[model samples]
Target chain A: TGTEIREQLNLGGIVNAQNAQLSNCSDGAAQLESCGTAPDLKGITGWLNTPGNKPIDLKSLRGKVVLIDFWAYSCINCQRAIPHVVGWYQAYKDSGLAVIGVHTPEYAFEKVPGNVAKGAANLGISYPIALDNNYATWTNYRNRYWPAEYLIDATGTVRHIKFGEGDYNVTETLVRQLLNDAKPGVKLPQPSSTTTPDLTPRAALTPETYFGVGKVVNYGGGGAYDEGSAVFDYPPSLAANSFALRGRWALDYQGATSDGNDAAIKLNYHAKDVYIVVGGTGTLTVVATLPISGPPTTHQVVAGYRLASETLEVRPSKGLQVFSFTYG
Target chain B: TGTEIREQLNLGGIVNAQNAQLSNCSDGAAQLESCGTAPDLKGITGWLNTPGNKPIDLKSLRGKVVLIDFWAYSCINCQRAIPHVVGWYQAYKDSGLAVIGVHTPEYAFEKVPGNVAKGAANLGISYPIALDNNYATWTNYRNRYWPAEYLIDATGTVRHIKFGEGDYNVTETLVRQLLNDAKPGVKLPQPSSTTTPDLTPRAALTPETYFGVGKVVNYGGGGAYDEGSAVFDYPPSLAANSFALRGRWALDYQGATSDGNDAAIKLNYHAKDVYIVVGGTGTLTVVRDGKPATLPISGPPTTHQVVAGYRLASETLEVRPSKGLQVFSFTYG
Candidate 1:
């Protein structure tokens, strides 16, 4: 296998002198703190457009690069990403990019029909956005943070996923690459020098261009939730929580405990490689993992917690996703 | 205090004599299995309807005999209750009585415009029905059962709440009394009675004219849940895992163990005099006041469980609205 995959797997291998410079990419964003089961995008209900009062479905976008954004108008972080999202949309519309804003309103006034519309218009949002004030779509997606993005390839499978902010250039580049690779006859668009050093970035297509999008899906919809079930059949593993047609996202604990005042957690499933997100300044550790039918590979973990004087951002690289957590 | 109010405070007074009889008259669906707080409704979102959607808001019909029906297309009990709900709508709509069908679908397919609209059409329902597929409104009401009905008074307060099906006469009578005593000049159109006396029997409403829909008001959207934010305002005597809430349905719980597997429950809260439709069949329980609380209230409690089994027919009995839960469902009632 290639050294890049070896590094991801945490296995040892030789690295070229030139690429070794990018070795320490800040331990890749918090994977688990932002941890949540992938949404069961199929069974969402009452997911309608606000002003038009119309229903929307995910099944329609079968063959396109879909970016599912979980956000709320009242969330400043979500609002901050709107301009970048608008830019991405304008640039990638014809290239087969679908930006779905799953709007979840945290405030009462935010849910007002006129206000939501006015806000969207004010933000110059032209893409189709659903007012998830009810959190129907959000819950269906099992999303935990605002400004969350799920990038799926043309074949309707997940290619990349990001939570929180910072690192927009790389994300945009990935989208551009995926869009260009959609159809065989289509020529890949040249990235602006400002966007990337390699305008024809595909020239360095990492040899495994076929790696494109991996199939990892999640199910959601039980309102007032304490637990969740996977829609796709999961393989038997002590740490497995979900199966994405190819692999799994396992949990460290099966069941959890809480004293109401004590730190507690409940995971959807278990897996080998795990990433967690941390909100503010809080200590986190795996209190328990429900149980796995059996055990397997290495227990890969990534932790993301805010430090003193550091503004907390729920992101993957920051280890904001709770690999394990402990609340005082 | 008024003589009547004093009597209500005395649990064993004359006002409770009839209540005792009615509680025993119930179908004895199940017993308290375990205790845990109901689902977190606050986390749920998406509850507003634009003009063309025929939206139904409880706050809008404060002075009418209102029945907020929590129904989902997948719920069998909800389907069965349709005739009664539709019949009541047609029978007393002009009499200042209104029935708002809250459509809470379990599956996404049920949320389809054509599916929900067609279900209403097929059921011959003319009353206003709002879709709760997003569950925002469902959680807002803290409702856990399907085919559940909340009878509200003319003053916009919740009076009687029932889960499941049966005893159509009892429900109709309470509604009729509310309409009769509505605000002055608020006209009520009478429905032509055609059934035989034997089939249309009703108990006398002497001392307790209204025990439910007329006695309580819902502070709409007043309670928003926050994660571990000192529930029940931090009750003095509480378990490490226990949480509490204070209101018409003050709830406390020890939290559930093994979410969807073999059911393990824990809860602490104030669940005053009320009935629930256990939507599923499982092991469930509850805790009251503090650590010293009863086990879970028993009912179907499984997926789409109903309360028809719990015979909480209309009977005047003073209850601790924030303490006693008459019935409990298995899953989302």
Candidate 2:
């Protein structure tokens, strides 16, 4: 069965993939208007809380202000946004705003409802969460990253979709606009006063070879991506401009005991080649091109330079193409 | 603070390293006995379903007939062994056999205990299962493969361990032997009349020139050497002379969504090198000594043939001095 096994599932309905625009996110990944006409959702069904528990359909929540948070339990970045979502629900519950947490499991054992429940309970998630056991929700939503958020208005149209973590103020502002549009009479409550950190644009992806863990972050769509997860260690992400690209570097093990855990590099359509300075104790940023293939062609763009604790600018031109990458 | 983040945490574990072994079974790969001593599972707590839903101590299952089944709901081979273990439980419970299912999650969503419960129920498992959400139990068990099993006896000591599904009769007999030796009054269960199919031995490995998706298979270890996994859609067996192996092959992504159904080979290990028989419909099986093999093989002598399906085997000499293998391949190209 290994020879016949599909290495990658057929991911349907992604504007970025359809347009071959994996290099850029600006100029509209696709017109938001065309997104509504596509299949609303597909390949989503799994047990949550109970064995027969059904998934919350995106079409059913059409008339409400649906804030789809793609989060994983294991992601600290996604976990950081939880209290904000919880706060939003408490503040805007009566205003027709429905927050759906799409809990897409990133590991083999995370499919258990009990584990998801425990994670949600700990994170104060009172919203209805759809458990994506078979990654049906992920493929259906065309979602590739964790810690993503999509604001779908009353007409079941995607008003705004933000991928990756941070940018709370922008996300909150988008939510406010959607909430106002969802209902005619309801006066919008002032969003909880949150500090807006200046998210600097990233510089070009410097050339270098690196080895590190890439986390699975939830980018909200329908309650699919969860708190942690979506963040795979050893995988890498590069951000420039308003867009950030995330992928994994893995090996091909076939459908054996070590399949998903294989060490091959992967990239989503939304991820363009770019580089940015990451805040931390001197973490070097590098860019491997569009399709990383063959042995590592290590090109150093940033020698180990010490960086102070601050967010840096992001850029898109410093991209490389390879079939895969590795972080050590 | 999310704004002024300090350090980025890495998700890479030991398996991602160059030297880590992926070919071994899940349970055997880890040092269960030396556990709580390792980094991954130390200082974590796991829930045990038996002895009344209390928290489990890794050392508690030590003195009993502990068949630590490291299984996931996704593994077919692991699922296949369900009946055998369940039968063993039914017949051997009074004789000190306590089957402990340690559920270590691989997919993030699979960590839910409820899904595991349903899976176990579907498998008709009446034995105890531990939700190893944090890998405490899995780490303690030191398992690697999905359906890996470890046999521990009543002396609070680990004895026989099995990786993957195979050797049910041998496993049953071993359990009986341990139980009989554990206590004077313990009466071992009689041998069941059920007959197991003949299986093959696990052969050595031969890596491919260019690794293809679903085209790689790792054979060897106790699982491949003695017990075999289902390869090429064939049922697996643990007969010493028989060979069963696991393999993966690349699927057609151009067409509509289909299944990866026929990419595997069967092999067994008997003497040393490795023996194998090809299975796939692919015409050529290339053998490049530097890379890891993609076909499953098992045989009697440790003197093995690693690359079973590739044609480059004849051209590529056995050069990897590290694995102790003589490589050859069969290819259609």
Candidate 3:
């Protein structure tokens, strides 16, 4: 059944039946524009996990080498780069480093201040995070991608920038060198890594699929799903990289909520490592029976080295909110 | 029986009042005392209701006792003080006293000379009225209030300064004394009581209400009153001193227009009468909560009295303005 569906459909666009093919990551920040003088963060609505919960102004941290990381908690690429940033903070705080994470949401639910607060606490992030709900700071930097890092010198000049994922050694060395320059003769620890190196394949799997009614590009369902709770019928099997849904679900702007206990979602993916953004307190049955307690951040579904196509059937309990599914 | 509301006469006093508190007159000038040689009238735009409509420079009127009364036709305090100033001019003109009502405007519509001319004609003021549209003379003398009087003696020195409306006897006495001192006992008439001093307390008046959406605090409509046109609905009732609208309307920074035929404006005011600054061509149906409202012949975009009541009580006011009429604001008195 799975093989037949894969033959009938591929997420890749087919201009003609005579030609349909499959391929996709690791363009090393190729066009990462050279950052000039660092722009002060603008249009931050609120702050989270700061000292006394006060906002940190860039003007006051003149002598410290600042690392401004722009990320959304639910984005897999943003999440994948957090361990490196967090490691830098832990290893180099005494060496004149101030890490600031600017949380600019890609979805509506992430705009909530409480969701971001709990999300930061769940990630063990003690550094200050600015909530850029209106994208003032994002637009100020003219940033185009998530998981972007800008290392500012002690004089507030933006020295190095990394746009997408990877190149941990290059980024870490940049931070280390800036710290060494900030205080000339002081000794500092060598560049460190928080998590082991990720050797997963970067082949085309599935793009981040939204359950909201706004965009349904990867949905392979026979029944239509709008906003609010609606019943969906499951097709026999999903295509190679298309997702389908069944049961009563409440589709909103950011994600879909399982309205009843018998709700199920199926995504046929191509990545060995699968992460799903889910929230609310409940248990979810996926490739493995997993417990979910969330401020709606990403959760790893399956972790492996080799990449293969597999059918994923997720049985969510009542009130489990499902946002997007990402692959590595 | 025709018990008509005196809507026309009421517009004179109420127009002067709406922007009284919102005046841009400096706070330091409120109690400015007569300290030195009087600053001569500096920026007079044009002379109205004057001798051959000519400007009377204070430099030429040196040997004569001059009472420069600063006023605006749309201001409430200025209208009340006009009666006394008119009386002084009538009784003392032959006795060597020159009373000049400087028509310094407080609103945009009053800056027009034609509107100021009509205002002077409506008040029956035969004495010379200076149109101080640029406020140069007002700023020169540091004058703050609508009805301020600078009484200068024959020696070209300011003798008495009165800020707001109150002291008719003391002001008239000062004028009489100045003329008496100028000459050796050439008897002048006793100070004329044209209109008694108005005793209405300053605290019991509603704020000037603007129709434009730029600054709408008194508006009470379901739909918003923003610039460039919007449709609004009239609420069932409104709070005291609040305003609402109905039908299609176009709002600018300074005024609002009745874009369609069915547009209506509802005002709940505290004063006994209400007046609005209007212009363009159209007829308005004036209705009130107390019943039996009156209407007058409409003309220029000048101030018009829309409501005239018998007593001071909170009442609902409604006006159905015809298409193309620009309404700036309403005042209460």
Task: For each candidate, give its TM-score against the true structure.
Answer: 0.27, 0.31, 0.44
Interface RMSD, every prediction, one decimal place: 33.8, 19.5, 38.3
- Predict model 1's lDDT versus the native: 0.39
For candidate 1, write residues B127-243 as lDDT tens digits. Answer: 777776677656545343555655666765455545444445655666776777675555544432333122211111011111121121111112343222222222343321122
Clashes of each: 130, 181, 6
Error of 1 at B172 (Å): 75
In model 2, where do residues sit more than 4 Å from their true spots? A1-34, A37-41, A47-54, A193-328, B1-333
Residue-level lDDT of model 3, residues B192-267, one tens digit each, is 8644554432223444566766655467665555789888887765645667888899999768898998998988
Best by lDDT: 3
Q: Considering lDDT, which of the candidate structures 1 and 2 is the better prediction for this target?
A: 2
B1-333: candidate 2 lDDT, tens digit per residue: 011111111111222111111211112222222111111224333444565676545466555666666665433445556777778888878777777677665443346666677677877887777676786555434353455566666654555555544556766777777777676577655664264332221211121111111222222212222212222233443221222223332222111111133333333212222222222122223234455544333321111244344221112222111121212221111
Location of the lowest summed lDDT over 10 successive residues in candidate 2 chain B? B1-10
- The candidates' DockQ values read 0.01, 0.01, 0.01
Ranking by lDDT: 3, 2, 1
